[PDB]
C-alpha cells in the first residue's frame, strides 16, 4: 500500500558488466576526484536504489 | 531571482551542456536528477532545455 | 482524496439498482482495485465485488460492476427484499487505502 | 478462514487500548497475505487503522501513525494492535480482517465494541 | 601444491574463486573470502580467515619417478573452463593435448591468481 522497498537495483557503477557477471558489492561509489570515505555528500553515492 | 509565485524561465539551445561549471556554486544542499543519471549529464544531448 | 457516494438508493424488488462511487483525486492512480462491501447491522462486512468487477465465491450472480474513467459502479440486478444493507466502496491511494461514505439501500413495496 | 477478536470493551480516557486478533485456517507468513484493523464509529463509514505484512513490515493510517502500534506472533497466529491516548470520542467497533492486494479486506470478524469513559 | 585462488583484490570486498584438492574430493567455492596473508595447508588449513556471501559451490572427483601435471585456466562469459592432462616423468619436449575437465558457471571477474601449497 505504501510501497514495497525490498527490491533493489544498481544505479551507480564504475563500468559495465560482462555477460552473466554478478556483483554483490555495496562499496560506495566515488563520482568525483576526492575520497568521500563513505560520506554520501556531493559526488558520493550508495550504488543501490 | 524571481519570487516563487512568479518564477522565471529561460530557454537553452544551440550550446554545449557542460555541467561541471555549475558545480562550484555551493557546499551543496539539494541535488536530484529524474530520468537521468548525474554521471550521464555530460554526455546526453537534448532537444528542448 | 475522498471517495464520494450517494446517501441512498431505492426501487421495487425485481428492478435494477445502481450504486456509484467516484474518486475526487488523482492519488488513486490506475484506480483498478475497487472493492464493494455489503454491511448488515450486527454482522461482519462481506466482500461482494473486488478488482472492479470480479465476484468472490458465495456471491450471487445478481451482483456485478464496471468502471468508466475514475468512477466505479455497483449493479444490483433482480433487486431482492433481502438486499437492504449499507454498501461501501474501497480503493487504494498513494499512502493509504480509503473507504466510501456508504450508501443506504431501501427496497420499496 | 476465520478471525476472532478479544480485549477490553471499556477504556478510561488517556489510557491505552489493547486488542488481540486470533486467526485460523491460514498462515500470515505467506507472500501477499497480511492482517489489518478497521474501525467503525456510530453513524460513520469504515476507517482504516493499521496493517502488518508477512515480513513484519508495519504500516499505519497517516492520521493515527503516532498513536497505533501493531505487532504479531506467528507461533500463536495472533496479531495485537495497541492504541494510546484514548479519547472520549474514540468510540467505535473494531474489526480484524485479512489483507490482500486484489481485494483489500476480506473474512472480516464480527468486531469488538469499545467505548471510552 | 594442491589448489589455486582466483580473483581481483583477494579480500572480503569482492567474490573470489577458491579451488582446493584433497585425498578424496575437490572442493570449489565462490565467496567473499578474506584470504590469509600467506595461504597454505597444514597436515586442517590456513587459506582464509572468514567469508561473507557465497554463491557457487561444487564438490567432485579430484583434479590431481616424478609426476607431471598440466592445466589450462580460461574464463569466458562467466564460465571458468579447466583443461588438464597427467603424465609420468625444465619442461619435456614433445606433443600432448589437454582435454576438458570441468566448466564452472560462476560469473566472476578474475585478474590475479595464487597457488596453494601444503606444508609438513
Ligand atoms: C576432504 O576434505 C573435506 C573437507 O572439505 C573433508 O570433509 C573430507 O573428509 C576430506 N577427504 C579426505 C579423503 O580426507
Ligand atoms: C551478504 O549480502 C547481503 C546483501 O548485501 C548483506 O545484507 C549480508 O550482510 C551479507 N552477508 C554477510 C555475512 O555480510
Ligand atoms: C575486473 O574489475 C576491474 C575493476 O576493478 C576492471 O578494470 C577489470 O577489467 C575487470 N576484469 C574483468 C575480467 O571483468
Contact (CB, 8 A) for C102 and C91: no
- Cβ neighbours of A4 in C, within 8 Å: none
Q: Locate E119 and state its grid cell.
A: 606444508
Count CA atoms within 13 Å of residue E102 on its CB side.
16
* C4-7 long-range Cβ contacts below 8 angstroms, 24+ apart: C4/C100, C4/C101, C5/C88, C5/C89, C5/C100, C5/C101, C5/C102, C5/C103, C6/C103, C7/C101, C7/C103, C7/C104
Report the C-alpha gap between E59 and E43 in whole angstroms.
Answer: 21
Report the C-alpha gap between E117 and E23 in whole angstroms.
Answer: 14
Contact (CB, 8 A) for A44 and E103: no
Write down the experimental method used for this entry.
cryo-EM
Report the C-alpha gap between D15 and D29 in whole angstroms.
Answer: 32
Give the three-state DSSP class for C8: strand
Q: What CATH class does C3-107 carry?
A: mainly beta
Report the C-alpha gap between C72 and C43 in whole angstroms.
Answer: 25
The alpha carbon of residue B28 is apart from the nearest alpha carbon of chain A, in Å, by 7
The alpha carbon of residue A43 is apart from the nearest alpha carbon of chain D, in Å, by 32
Q: Which segments of D37-113 does DSSP mark as H helices, in order? A: none
CB-nearest to D46 from C46, C88, C92 is C88
Report the C-alpha gap between C93 and D5 in whole angstroms.
Answer: 28
- Cβ neighbours of C51 in D, within 8 Å: 102-103
User: Ligand nearest E7 Cα, by number?
Assistant: 3
Which helix (H) or strand (E) segment holds residue D68: the answer is strand D68-73
Q: Give the resolution value in Å.
A: 3.1
Contact (CB, 8 A) for C108 and C80: no
- Cβ neighbours of A21 in E, within 8 Å: 78, 107-109
CB-nearest to E53 from A18, A20, A24 is A24
- Cβ neighbours of D106 in C, within 8 Å: 47, 50, 56
Contact (CB, 8 A) for A43 and B42: no
Q: For C40, phi and psi rounded to 5 degrees?
A: -100, 135
Q: What is the DSSP letter of D43?
A: T
Please write down the HEC assignment for all residues of chain E: CCEEEEECCCCCCCCEEEEECCCCCEEEEEEEEEEEEEEEEECCEEEEEEEEEEEEEEEECCCCCCEEEEEEEEEECCEEEEEEEEEECCCCCCCCCCEEEEEEECCCCCCEEEECEEEC
Residue matched to cell numbers 564460465: E79
Report the C-alpha gap between E27 and E58 in whole angstroms.
Answer: 6
Report the C-alpha gap between A27 and A17 in whole angstroms.
Answer: 16
Q: What CATH class does D2-116 carry?
A: mainly beta
Q: Locate E107 and state its grid cell.
A: 560469473
Q: Locate B3 and state its grid cell.
A: 519570487
Report the C-alpha gap between C82 and E39 in whole angstroms.
Answer: 81
Are chains D and C in contact at 3+ CB pairs closer than 8 Å? yes
Q: What is the DSSP letter of C56?
A: P
Closest CA to E16 of E62, E59, E47: E47
Residues of B with CB under 8 A from a CB of A: 23, 28, 31, 37-39
Strands (DSSP E) found in chain C: 8-11, 17-22, 35-39, 46-49, 63-68, 71-76, 86-92, 97-99, 103-107
Tell me, rounded to whole angstroms, the distance of Cα A29 from its chain centroid: 6
- Residues A20, E105: C-beta atoms closer than 8 Å: yes
For chain C, the domains span 3-107
Contact (CB, 8 A) for E19 and E120: no
Q: Sign of the CA dihedral B21, B23, B27, B31?
A: positive
Report the C-alpha gap between C43 and D93 in whole angstroms.
Answer: 11
Pocket of ligand 1 (CB under 6 A): E 22-24, 27
Please write down the HEC assignment for all residues of chain A: CCCCCCCCCECCCCCCCCCCCCCCCCCCEECCCCCCCCCCCCCEECCEC
Q: Locate A28 and state its grid cell.
A: 560506495
Closest CA to D85 of D13, D8, D18, D10: D13
The DSSP bridge pattern shows strands C8-11 and C103-107 to be: parallel
Tell me, rounded to whole angstroms, the distance of Cα C12 from its chain centroid: 19
DSSP percent split of chain B into helix, strand, coil, nearest 5: 10, 0, 90
The residue in chain D having the minimum alpha-carbon distance to the alpha carbon of residue C47 is D106
Residue matched to cell numbers 487503522: D49
Question: Which strand ranges, in their side-by-side order, compose the sheet holding C71-76?
Answer: C17-22, C71-76, C63-68
Report the C-alpha gap between D3 and C67 in whole angstroms.
Answer: 32
Q: Locate C102 and state its grid cell.
A: 456508504
Closest CA to E55 of E28, E20, E29: E29
Q: Locate C90 and state its grid cell.
A: 474501497
The DSSP bridge pattern shows strands C71-76 and C63-68 to be: antiparallel
The DSSP bridge pattern shows strands E26-42 and E117-119 to be: parallel
Q: How far is the CA of E69 from the centre of ligand 1 (A)?
A: 22
Q: How far is the CA of E36 from the centre of ligand 2 (A)?
A: 21
Q: Any CB–CB contact under 8 A between A20 and chain E? A: yes
Are chains A and C in contact at 3+ CB pairs closer than 8 Å? yes
DSSP percent split of chain D into helix, strand, coil, nearest 5: 0, 50, 50
* D21-24 long-range Cβ contacts below 8 angstroms, 24+ apart: D21/D78, D21/D79, D21/D80, D21/D81, D21/D96, D21/D109, D22/D76, D22/D77, D22/D78, D23/D77, D23/D78, D23/D79, D23/D96, D23/D98, D24/D77
- Residues C35, D47: C-beta atoms closer than 8 Å: no
The alpha carbon of residue C81 is apart from the nearest alpha carbon of chain A, in Å, by 37
CB-nearest to A20 from E14, E32, E107 is E107
Closest CA to C51 of E1, E64, D103, D64: D103
User: Ligand nearest A6 Cα, by number?
Assistant: 2
Amino acid at each position: 500500500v505504501s510501497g514495497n522497498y525490498n527490491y533493489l537495483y544498481r544505479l551507480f557503477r564504475k563500468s559495465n558488466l560482462k555477460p552473466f557477471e554478478r556483483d554483490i558489492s555495496t562499496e560506495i561509489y566515488q563520482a568525483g576526484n576526492k575520497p568521500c570515505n563513505g560520506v554520501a555528500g556531493f559526488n558520493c553515492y550508495f550504488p543501490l536504489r | 531571482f524571481a519570487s516563487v509565485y512568479a518564477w522565471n524561465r529561460k530557454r537553452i539551445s544551440n550550446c554545449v551542456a557542460d555541467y561541471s561549471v555549475l558545480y562550484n556554486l555551493a557546499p551543496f544542499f539539494t541535488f536530484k536528477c529524474y530520468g537521468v543519471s548525474p554521471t550521464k549529464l555530460n554526455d546526453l544531448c537534448f532537444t528542448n532545455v | 482524496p475522498v471517495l464520494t457516494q450517494p446517501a441512498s438508493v431505492s426501487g421495487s424488488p425485481g428492478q435494477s439498482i445502481t450504486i456509484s462511487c467516484t474518486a475526487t483525486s488523482s492519488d488513486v492512480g490506475n484506480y483498478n482495485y475497487v472493492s464493494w462491501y455489503q454491511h448488515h447491522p450486527g454482522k461482519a462486512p462481506k466482500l461482494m465485488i473486488y478488482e472492479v468487477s470480479n465476484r468472490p465465491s458465495g456471491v450471487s450472480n445478481r451482483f456485478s460492476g464496471s468502471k468508466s474513467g475514475n468512477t466505479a459502479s455497483l449493479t444490483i440486478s433482480g433487486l431482492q427484499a433481502e438486499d437492504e444493507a449499507d454498501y461501501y466502496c474501497s480503493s487504494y491511494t498513494s499512502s493509504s487505502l480509503l473507504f466510501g461514505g456508504g450508501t443506504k439501500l431501501t427496497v420499496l413495496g | 478462514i476465520t478471525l476472532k477478536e478479544s480485549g477490553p470493551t471499556l477504556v478510561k480516557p488517556t489510557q491505552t487500548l489493547t486488542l488481540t486478533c486470533t486467526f485460523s485456517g491460514f498462515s500470515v507468513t505467506t507472500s501477499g497475505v497480511g492482517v489489518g484493523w478497521i474501525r467503525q464509529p456510530p453513524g460513520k463509514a469504515l476507517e482504516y487503522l493499521a496493517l502488518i505484512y508477512w515480513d513484519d513490515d508495519k504500516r499505519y493510517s497517516t492520521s493515527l501513525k503516532s498513536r497505533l502500534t501493531i505487532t504479531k506472533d506467528t507461533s500463536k497466529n495472533q496479531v495485537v494492535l495497541t492504541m494510546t491516548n484514548m479519547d472520549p470520542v474514540d468510540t467505535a467497533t473494531y474489526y480484524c480482517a485479512r489483507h490482500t492486494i486484489p481485494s483489500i479486506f476480506d473474512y472480516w470478524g464480527q468486531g469488538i465494541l469499545v467505548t471510552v469513559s | 601444491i594442491r589448489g589455486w585462488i582466483f580473483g581481483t583484490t583477494l579480500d572480503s570486498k569482492t567474490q573470489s574463486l577458491l579451488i582446493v584438492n584433497n585425498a578424496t574430493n575437490v572442493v570449489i567455492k565462490v565467496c567473499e573470502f578474506q584470504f590469509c596473508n600467506d595461504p597454505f595447508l597444514d597436515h586442517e588449513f590456513r587459506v582464509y580467515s572468514s567469508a561473507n556471501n557465497c554463491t557457487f559451490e561444487y564438490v567432485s572427483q579430484p583434479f590431481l619417478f616424478k609426476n607431471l601435471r598440466e592445466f589450462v585456466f580460461k574464463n569466458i562469459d562467466g564460465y571458468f573452463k579447466i583443461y588438464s592432462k597427467h603424465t609420468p616423468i625444465d619442461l619435456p619436449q614433445g606433443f600432448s593435448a589437454l582435454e576438458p575437465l570441468v566448466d564452472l558457471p560462476i560469473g566472476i571477474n578474475i585478474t590475479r591468481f595464487q597457488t596453494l601449497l601444503a606444508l609438513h
